Design a protein around this ligand. Structure first.
Ligand code: HEM
Ligand code: VT1
Length: 449
């Protein structure tokens, strides 16, 4: 009934906060290499943090119920973003229902309009921003704009996109977002109630009231039948809890924020990496192979084109998430003892499973730093870029749609070149990890026939 060994702590209260904050990949690896155990504990803020660094053992982390292993305590930090009693802040039965309602809004049934809607906004953005035959842009920054744009198009009804537009909205997000401090989960007391938080306060409330407005409007056009609007907001209003109740404005607001917040960063980063590797000259063959798959498409693309007819592109995307998972760490609060291989993990520990670590296990992913889209996880379940089990990603399919879609539209109507020797080094200093902002400059060369 014993622990994984604990890495030596040079200074107790810090634990390993420094070498962790500086390069968590190198660090966690060494812990692994020296400890010689995939599974090991580290001290951060004097907090037992046991990382599951063995691909075989993932099922352990993901399979267990929240009651046994709970996200909530860990993920409190979102609550201001999402709201009181929204998602994790909410009781698990409810949070589940909410997540489900959302998940339904993101099934492939809804996707019918999306590919065209997304392609439109990308072509808009390009023409307004890539006006010249050549030119230089920040790829991470542009992609960010393309994502929030194409998303709103995808999940926002006309009227809502009238009162509220993508660029502004992005601004609102970042405003609520700037509020976050990552340290906080492990040490939640730092969250107990913080300067811009008010902005998240105001950022959110502003949004909320806009909607509260929007709703009143759409209620009084059912009489007409004027529009049958089934955008994300639509669905959420038509949802009913089991107990027969409905979602209060706040919960609706929370769930839309959460939806948009997640995709925005995770997706824009994914897009960016993916393009980068492809652009790079070493990756010619892959770039060429990409083409062999999208050259023979009509300019206007449909659903069949993207899911069923771009297997490979999707490989590039997944490989990109494999090499540099946007979310380094997933976590639970061990609320009861759990077996993990030959070890046990004590109620009260903090238990994590790191895509970042796992994606660089050699058994599973030899030479991980190599971006090889045609590589296949050597150990089943190794890849966890979208997590697994109960709490696996719901946005996964929609995201793949957008990134895949964006890749096709951009590359089809453009070429590209990295303004550097080598693909950008990730920047581990952000809550969600993306390539380093300053190096994401590149030259766009238009194409013509
Ligand atoms: C590259 C794109 C994405 C990546 C890499 C990604 C990654 C992940 C990962 C690793 C998890 C596991 C969370 C955990 O175990 O703590 C997860 C969960 C989740 N993701 Fe994503 N995600 C992506 C896109 C999206 C998008 C676009 C949305 C919403 C639009 C979304 C919504 C969620 C939600 C709601 C969960 C919680 C699942 C649950 O707790 O049941 N994701 N995602
Ligand atoms: O899991 C998220 C993020 N996500 C997942 N897919 N897309 N986005 C999430 C959860 C539910 C949602 F509805 C929307 C979300 F975006 C989340 F809850 F907010 C979430 C939880 C924890 C973290 C997170 C936790 C700890 C972190 O520590 C940084 C470190 F790894 F230590 F370097 C960094 C990030 C990020 N996002």
């Amino acid at each position: 009934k014993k622990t994984p060994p604990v890495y030596p702590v040079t200074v107790p209260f810090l634990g390993h906060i420094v070498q962790f904050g500086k390069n968590p990949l190198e660090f966690m690896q060494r812990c692994k290499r020296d400890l010689k155990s995939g599974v090991f504990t580290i001290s951060i803020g004097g907090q037992r943090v046991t990382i599951v660094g063995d691909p075989h053992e993932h099922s352990r982390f993901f399979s267990p119920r929240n009651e046994i292993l709970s996200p909530r305590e860990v993920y409190t930090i979102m609550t201001p973003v999402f709201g009181e009693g929204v998602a994790y802040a909410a009781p698990y039965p409810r949070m589940r229902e909410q997540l489900n309602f959302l998940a339904e809004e993101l099934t492939i049934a809804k996707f019918q309009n999306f590919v065209p809607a997304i392609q439109h906004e990308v072509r808009k953005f390009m023409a307004e921003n890539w006006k010249e035959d050549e030119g230089v842009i920040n790829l991470l920054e542009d992609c960010g704009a393309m994502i929030i744009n194409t998303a709103c198009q995808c999940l926002f009804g006309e009227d809502l996109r009238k009162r509220l537009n993508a660029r502004h909205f992005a601004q609102l997000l970042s405003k609520m977002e700037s509020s976050l401090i990552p340290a906080a989960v492990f040490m939640p007391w730092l969250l107990r109630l913080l300067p811009q938080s008010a902005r998240c306060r105001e950022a959110r409330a502003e949004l909320q009231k806009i909607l509260g407005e929007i709703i009143v409007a759409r209620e009084k056009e059912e009489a007409s039948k004027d529009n049958n609007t089934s955008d994300l907001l639509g669905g959420l209003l038509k949802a009913v809890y089991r107990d027969g109740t409905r979602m209060s404005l706040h919960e609706v607001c929370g769930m839309i924020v959460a939806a948009m917040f997640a995709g925005q960063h995770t997706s824009t980063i994914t897009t960016s990496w993916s393009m980068l590797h492809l652009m790079h000259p070493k990756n010619k063959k892959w770039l060429d192979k990409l083409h062999k798959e999208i050259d023979e498409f009509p300019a206007q693309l449909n659903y069949d084109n993207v899911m069923d007819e771009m297997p490979f592109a999707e490989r590039c995307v997944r490989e990109s998430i494999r090499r540099d998972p946007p979310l380094l760490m997933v976590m639970r609060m061990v609320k009861a003892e759990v077996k993990v291989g030959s070890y046990v993990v004590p109620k009260g520990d903090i238990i994590a499973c790191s895509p970042l670590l796992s994606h660089h296990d050699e058994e599973a992913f030899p030479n991980p730093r190599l971006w090889d889209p045609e590589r296949d996880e050597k150990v089943d379940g190794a890849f966890i870029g979208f997590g697994a089990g109960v709490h696996k990603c719901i946005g996964q399919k929609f995201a793949l749609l957008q990134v895949k879609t964006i890749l096709a539209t951009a590359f089809r109507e453009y070429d590209f070149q990295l303004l550097r020797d080598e693909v950008p080094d990730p920047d581990y200093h952000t809550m969600v990890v993306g390539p380093t902002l300053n190096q994401c400059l590149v030259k766009y060369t238009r194409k013509k026939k």
